[PDB]
RNA sequence: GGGGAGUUUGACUGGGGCGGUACACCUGUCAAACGGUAACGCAGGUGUCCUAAGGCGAGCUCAGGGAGGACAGAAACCUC
């Protein structure tokens, strides 16, 4: 048997692009990201100052956004279609989440505009389960127990069964 | 305008002088489980800075570590 609603569902999908310098490149990356995600993304300032990468304290160097639900699985479907539903054993974290990256963006269904240029990005997905909001709600916060959490094997099974993908070793 | 006049040229202090400030303040210890308690005892700090680094209210949680993610690495950004 099974519990009808202890099943696995994706609860958020995070997209980010880290360009490493503020300016026209940054705002065009924000533009392509918001065109892809249908909503305005946000800028993240540099935490520290390191001159090896040519960055300083508190300038926007990356643009990221998060999605839930319908648009989340559509974007994830596009990304996995680009990655031909192929992932590696080490692509999955110990907490049940996973992710990957796309070297360039116009392949997943984005028209090439010569002005904006080309940009890669990182997809990440946080596998969830009904009741995970306990860990972050305000009134009576608590843990999510031991049985209810997600492990690497469960994430692998969910990925290979729902999206009929292949986990090549590596 | 030392030609001439009057006067002054601190204190502390293992003699005085040179050095130093133990000369006004602050922290720990000395200090002997109330408080107080000495030495040129020990380790140090002060003559500032702030329109917010003051005053309320709201919302968040930090250092670090582990596991993941294109360039990305020991270190850039995202997630748990
Ligand atoms: Mg005389
Ligand atoms: Mg006594």
Curated annotation (Swiss-Prot):
* Chain residue numbers at which the record places covalent cross-link Glycyl lysine isopeptide (Lys-Gly) (interchain with G-Cter in SUMO2): 31, 45, 147
Keywords in alphabetical order: Acetylation, Cytoplasm, Isopeptide bond, Nucleus, Phosphoprotein, Ribonucleoprotein, Ribosomal protein, RNA-binding, rRNA-binding, Ubl conjugation
Q: Which InterPro entries match?
A: Ribosomal_uL5, Ribosomal_uL5_C, Ribosomal_uL5_CS, Ribosomal_uL5_dom_sf, Ribosomal_uL5_N
Q: Which Pfam families match?
A: Ribosomal_L5, Ribosomal_L5_C
Q: Which residues form the signal peptide?
A: none
One biological process term in Gene Ontology = translation
Q: What is its main location?
A: nucleus
Cell location: Nucleus, Nucleolus; Cytoplasm
Listed GO CC annotations: cytoplasm; nucleolus; ribonucleoprotein complex; ribosome
- Record PTM Phosphothreonine, positions in chain: 37, 40
> Where is the PTM N6-acetyllysine found along the chain?
45, 78
- Select a single GO molecular function from the record's annotations and give it: structural constituent of ribosome
Q: What does this protein's UniProt record list under function?
A: Component of the ribosome, a large ribonucleoprotein complex responsible for the synthesis of proteins in the cell. The small ribosomal subunit (SSU) binds messenger RNAs (mRNAs) and translates the encoded message by selecting cognate aminoacyl-transfer RNA (tRNA) molecules. The large subunit (LSU) contains the ribosomal catalytic site termed the peptidyl transferase center (PTC), which catalyzes the formation of peptide bonds, thereby polymerizing the amino acids delivered by tRNAs into a polypeptide chain.
State the family it belongs to: Belongs to the universal ribosomal protein uL5 family.
Quaternary structure, per UniProt, is: Component of the large ribosomal subunit (LSU). Part of the 5S RNP complex, which is a LSU subcomplex composed of the 5S RNA, RPL5 and RPL11. Component of a hexameric 5S RNP precursor complex, composed of 5S RNA, RRS1, RPF2/BXDC1, RPL5, RPL11 and HEATR3; this complex acts as a precursor for ribosome assembly. Interacts with PML. Interacts with MDM2 (via its RanBP2-type zinc finger domain); negatively regulates MDM2-mediated TP53 ubiquitination and degradation. Interacts with NOP53; retains RPL11 into the nucleolus.
**The name this protein goes by in its record:** Large ribosomal subunit protein uL5
Annotated organism of origin = Oryctolagus cuniculus
| Gene from which this protein is expressed | RPL11
